[PDB]
Amino acid sequence: DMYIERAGDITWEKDAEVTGNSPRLDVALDESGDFSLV
Amino acid sequence: TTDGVYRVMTRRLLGSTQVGVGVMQEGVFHTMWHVTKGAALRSGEGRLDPYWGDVKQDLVSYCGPWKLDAAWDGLSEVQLLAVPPGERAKNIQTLPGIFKTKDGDIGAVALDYPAGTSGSPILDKSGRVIGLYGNGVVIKNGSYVSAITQGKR
Numbered sequence: 263d264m265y266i267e268r269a270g271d272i273t274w275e276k277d278a279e280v281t282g283n284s285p286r287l288d289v290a291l292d293e294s295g296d297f298s299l300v
Numbered sequence: 301t302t303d304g305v306y307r308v309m310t311r312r313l314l315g316s317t318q319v320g321v322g323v324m325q326e327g328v329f330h331t332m333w334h335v336t337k338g339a340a341l342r343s344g345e346g347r348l349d350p351y352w353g354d355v356k357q358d359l360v361s362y363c364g365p366w367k368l369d370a371a372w373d374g375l376s377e378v379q380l381l382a383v384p385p386g387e388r389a390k391n392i393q394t395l396p397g398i399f400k401t402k403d404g405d406i407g408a409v410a411l412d413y414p415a416g417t418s419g420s421p422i423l424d425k426s427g428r429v430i431g432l433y434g435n436g437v438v439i440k441n442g443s444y445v446s447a448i449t450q451g452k453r
């Protein structure tokens with residue numbers, strides 16, 4: 263039995279840390295909602 | 301029922317376990333299907349019943365139809381509002397990449413958080429939720445990339 267607990271407002275943070283790259287990927291999405299690489 | 305980001309918890313396992321995250325907006329709770337498998341949810345002494353969902357999109361809404369309709373502009377940085385298990389909410393800014401599919405392009409964020417972070421919202425600069433984090437793929441070098449998964453309003 264699952265339950266929910268509030269964790270915060272949904273807001274943009276002006277001085278957030280910036281990270282992560284920006285990959286361009288060919289993918290397929292199957293009937294089960296799972297992504298795979300092509 | 302206040303707007304905002306919520307943890308999705310279960311006690312059916314040892315202690316209390318965070319299975320995911322979701323977004324309350326306009327009286328509707330939004331999360332990824334794989335987090336709840338479409339089960340009912342408790343909020344305090346109240347109950348949230350599923351209203352819409354779709355395994356292929358990997359999304360589910362509770363108490364009403366899917367309300368989130370903002371979309372990545374394809375150009376600008378976004379923020380993941382990561383709510384990791386046992387940890388405070390934190391904003392992470394990134395320029396999305398792109399999932400290219402036979403049915404068109406989807407934004408994707410190259411950020412790796414525990415599975416229980418699934419359902420955390422991705423935001424544009426206006427604070428609008430452009431999709432949810434947690435349905436993705438592992439790329440050649442072993443790292444994880446999440447689609448920016450958005451429903452239809």
Ligand SMILES: COc1cccc2c1CNC2
Pocket residue numbers: 294295296334355358434435436
């Ligand atoms: C455990 O299942 C998972 C986990 C992550 C994402 C998806 C599923 C199923 N469809 C998308």
Ligand SMILES: COc1cccc2c1CNC2
Pocket residue numbers: 384412413414
């Ligand atoms: C605690 O597990 C991990 C593992 C990888 C990345 C992150 C965490 C937590 N936040 C970022």
